[PDB]
């Protein structure tokens, strides 16, 4: 997260860390056995970490947990990120407590210049690098299709919005991958892609959860 600042221990309690030797995605915990998370984290050997607040000291309320599924979406094009997004199985149900809480999938999408949340552990610098071990968060407005379109021009599809500030400064980044984009209390959006991070004119691009509901809804009761 550029631009953005530190949330405090365990102010996202559904924010997940995905960890393989190291951090390397977000996701969201969507209830106690099961993370949405972005298709491009997909790996083998996945721990979901919950509770986290430093990734790098054990403060007390963590909970780590090996995947024992994953599940990318079938229509996934790495190419082009249209429709990314995962389903990650628990192997164990996680306990859920004030600091490890499941978000809400929406009802509905969310309208054109609602304000969200974004959260993650990603880069916090737009040139260069800076990797924080505490939680980073933005307030940003989701933004118009067109404006989107336009500064991505055939790049979106109807799965993907745009969420930030055109003049920049203020956007995720890389390691924030898979994050979540809360809005009035449902996720929204999966940090996805962009160009740079917090460039004037290139806001961040987000996978459209809404889309995806009743899909979660039918994977999660089959699997
Ligand atoms: N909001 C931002 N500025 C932001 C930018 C980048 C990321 C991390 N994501 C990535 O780097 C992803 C995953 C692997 C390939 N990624 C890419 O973004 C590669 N670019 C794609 C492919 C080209 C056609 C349209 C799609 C964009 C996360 C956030
Ligand atoms: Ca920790």
Same mark, same amino acid.
């Given at each position: 997260i550029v631009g953005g600042y530190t949330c405090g221990a365990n102010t996202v309690p559904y924010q997940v860390s995905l960890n393989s030797g190291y951090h390397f995605c977000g996701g969201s915990l969507?209830?106690?056995q099961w993370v949405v998370s972005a298709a491009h984290c997909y790996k083998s050997g996945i721990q979901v970490r919950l509770?986290?607040?430093?990734?790098?000291?054990?403060?007390?309320?963590?909970?780590?947990?090996? #995947?024992?599924?994953?599940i990318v979406h079938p229509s996934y094009n790495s190419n082009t990120l249209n429709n990314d997004i995962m389903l990650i199985k628990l192997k164990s149900a996680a306990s859920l407590n004030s600091?490890? #809480?499941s978000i809400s999938l929406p009802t509905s999408c969310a309208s054109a210049g609602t304000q969200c949340l974004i959260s993650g552990w990603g880069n !916090?610098?737009?040139?260069? !690098?800076?990797?924080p071990d505490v939680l980073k968060c933005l307030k940003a407005p989701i933004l118009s299709d067109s404006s989107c379109k336009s500064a991505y021009p055939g790049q979106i599809t109807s799965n993907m919005f745009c969420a930030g500030y055109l003049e920049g400064g203020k956007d995720?980044?890389?390691?924030?991958?898979?994050?979540?984009?809360?809005?009035?209390?449902?996720?929204?959006?999966?940090?996805?892609?962009?160009?740079?991070?917090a460039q004037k004119n290139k806001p961040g691009v987000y996978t459209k959860v809404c889309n995806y509901v009743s899909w979660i809804k039918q994977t999660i009761a089959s699997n």
């Open positions: 969507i209830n106690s509770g986290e607040d430093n990734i790098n000291v054990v403060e007390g309320n963590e909970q780590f947990i090996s #995947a024992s599924k994953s600091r490890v #809480a !916090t610098k737009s040139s260069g !690098t800076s990797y995720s980044c890389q390691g924030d991958s898979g994050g979540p984009v809360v809005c009035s209390g449902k996720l929204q959006g999966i940090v996805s892609w962009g160009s740079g991070c």
